[PDB]
Design a protein around this ligand. Sequence first.
Ligand code: NA
Ligand code: NA
Lengths: 146, 142
Amino acid sequence: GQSRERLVKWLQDAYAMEKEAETMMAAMASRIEHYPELKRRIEQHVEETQQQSAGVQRCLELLNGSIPTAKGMMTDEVTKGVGISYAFEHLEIASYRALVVAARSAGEQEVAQICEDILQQEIEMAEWLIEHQEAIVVAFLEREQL
Amino acid sequence: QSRERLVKWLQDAYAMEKEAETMMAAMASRIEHYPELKRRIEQHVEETQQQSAGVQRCLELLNGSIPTAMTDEVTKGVGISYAFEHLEIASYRALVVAARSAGEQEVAQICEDILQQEIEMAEWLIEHQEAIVVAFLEREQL
Ligand code: NA
Ligand code: NA
């Protein structure tokens, strides 16, 4: 009842969140000239994301909830991209944690697993950025004032 | 140029803190059912006012300018709170690097102290997150 349709409600948010993530990454990847590791990483996550929402959509198809309708719409952009990248990966964490709860409460244990697995990838990814972060910042600085 | 990148990222963060302050000074008023939460956010609405003023003392020191210009609310806002505090972290960590590179050790200490508050605050949210979600759910399908 309200359990399914709250789960469906948050499933739809995420599906759309994953599409925004996929475009935000598929576009941060385009700007990288100086961090093959960084760039290499984001590319791998653009593919992982595509598989997330497709997983989310299987969950929306299962519970009869519909599948959200697409919306359109000395440079610093790389240091600050790693910063927004990290914050969105935490937006995602929080959301998926709270999905595992809306799934458990709804007794949809299969949905809950999907969500815990997507969650671990966001954690994995977020971890990748905040560790490699410091080097990216420094190299930026040393390069800028060369 | 070391100074002017430090000033540049100091400028961003001041505007960030001022957005943070106005976003929390709003979030804390939507709360009706989470006493600890409301009471925690309030406390940081002011930790925050003490942050940017600190940032400003840094902007004034380095001769840089000071920048210019049922339904979901609760759990979702908790999620955005946690994401922003994490935006902040990253930004203050990068400041600690730019301060250091620029040989402004005292600016760095400030940035490291604000970094500790954002970690402590994001820590408070994600620990208490699971309860807010659970109580929200339970409540809405009584
Ligand atoms: Na993702
Ligand atoms: Na803050």
